[PDB]
Each structure stands twice: as C-alpha cells, then as structure tokens.
Design a protein around this ligand. Structure first.
Ligand code: MTX
Length: 236
C-alpha cells in the first residue's frame, strides 16, 4: 500500500494549483484523507481533512478560504485545490490516511514539492541528544482542548524521508516499532521515551493531537531534533 502525490512544481503567486493523491491498492475500510505540509527545514503543519464520504471537511486557519479538499471514491483520488497561492505556501505536501476516527495517520505518501514564486501549539523542546545506550525523553505540552481531550500520537521523520507513525493512542506501537520506544500521557502533556538509543534513532520527532470545539482539526507539535552523539558517557 503506497500513497502517491502528484501535481507539484513551480507556480506563480496568486495562481491555483491542484494536487492529487492516488493509492497503489484499494481498501475495504473507510479512510479519512488528510493533507500535511512541511516548508523546507520547518516542522509539519496539518492542512486539511475530508471524511470518507466527502460530507465533512476541516481546514487549518492558515489555508481556510483558499484551499479546497475533495475526493473521487470511484477513481480513488483525493485532491487539494490550492487557490490564491502565497509565498508562504511553499512546502512539500503529503497526503496521509486515517482509518475512520482513530486519530493517527497510518499511511503517508512521499510528498510533492510546491514552490510559489513571488519575484494553539503543542510545544516540544527544539533539541534533544544522548549517547548510544542512554534513555532520552521528549516532552509535548498542550492545553485541555487538545492533549487534555485527545489521544496523543508520535511521528518519526528520518532525514530525507516521509514521516512514519511511531506511537499511537498515547502508548501503542505499530508492528515494526521496537519496545525501546514508549509513550505516555498525563493531563495536558505527553512524552516520548527512547531507551537504548541507537544511531538509527537520529531523526526529527513530532507529537500530534487534535483541536477545535469537536477536535476536528489536526495539530502537530513544534518538533524535536534528536542527535545521537558519537561520544561516550563515561567520566574518563
Ligand atoms: C489508506 N488507503 C489508501 C486510500 C484509501 N482511500 C482513498 N480514497 C480516495 N478517494 N482516494 C484515495 N487516494 C484513497 N486511498 C489504503 C489503506 C489500506 C489498504 C490495504 O491495506 N489494502 C489491503 C487489503 C486490506 C484492506 O482492505 O484494508 C490490500 O492488500 O490491498 C489499501 C488502501
């Protein structure tokens, strides 16, 4: 199962660009489909969601009134129509899939880059580091409306790759995520714990929840860059 975005490229400010998200296989389950974007060198920003039947849509405040999400279930395509494009919309655009109302993105496309030419917040520590074998913790603090009212998920983004689900529903691990990774949630905060730190763990880590009067909008944490130091932690 592979999601494939297309339609990216260079576009003039004020123009309209339509992105598409296709799937390598069809599913018997019902999937809400999302768009998530990431400006070069910046964090993930949730953009929009469409319900399985197209009845319900939600948008981030930064794109409301300009972007339209739609889907063609017969052709098995999801669209993001980006109108009135601004320089600030320059980003890699991912389409992501959520089964029903689970609240976590199981599948991500590779993303498509959009360059526009002009010529509440989940707080995370910006940087974390440790030596091999050590245990590192990464906090994510929100409010009663987001973390205090929803499951918290965690996503890992290795350099030059699409984000991947790491922890869902506060503390559950997908198949293929070792028990070294563990999540917890208490009140308005959550934390990701990485024990037995390894070189492969060097990546960006994002917490994620939902917000709004009915938690209809997605929200990603500010992001934490984890560095696995090429150093010992003995005294000497
Ligand atoms: C999330 N999704 C892609 C998906 C779903 N709905 C869409 N809906 C629209 N309108 N457009 C798409 N791009 C689209 N893509 C999936 C998810 C899982 C499976 C999948 O695991 N299929 C298994 C069978 C198990 C299953 O049905 O889930 C297989 O072997 O083919 C396929 C597609």
């Amino acid at each position: 199962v592979q999601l494939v975005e297309s339609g990216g490229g260079l576009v003039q400010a004020g123009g309209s660009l339509r992105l598409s998200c296709a799937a390598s296989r069809r599913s018997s389950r019902s999937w809400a489909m999302h768009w998530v974007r990431q400006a070069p060198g910046k964090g993930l920003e949730w953009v929009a969601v469409i319900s399985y039947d197209g009845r319900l849509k939600y948008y981030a405040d930064s794109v409301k009134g300009r972007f339209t999400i739609s889907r063609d279930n017969a052709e098995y395509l999801v669209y993001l129509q980006m109108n009135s494009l601004r320089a600030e919309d320059t980003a890699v655009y991912y389409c992501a899939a959520e089964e029903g109302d689970g609240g976590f993105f199981d599948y991500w496309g590779q993303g498509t880059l959009v360059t526009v030419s002009s010529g509440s917040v989940l707080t995370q520590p910006p940087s974390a580091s440790g030596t091999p074998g050590q245990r590192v913790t990464i906090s994510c603090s929100g409010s009663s409306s987001n973390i205090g009212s929803n499951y918290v998920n965690w996503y890992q983004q290795l350099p030059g790759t699409a984000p991947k689900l790491l922890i869902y529903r506060n503390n559950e691990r997908p198949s293929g995520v070792p028990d070294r990774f563990s999540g917890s949630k208490s009140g308005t905060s959550a934390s990701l714990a990485i024990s037995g730190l390894r070189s492969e763990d060097e990546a960006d880590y994002y917490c994620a929840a939902w917000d709004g009067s009915l938690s209809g909008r997605g929200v990603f944490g500010t992001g934490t860059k984890l560095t696995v130091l090429e150093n010992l932690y003995f005294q000497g």
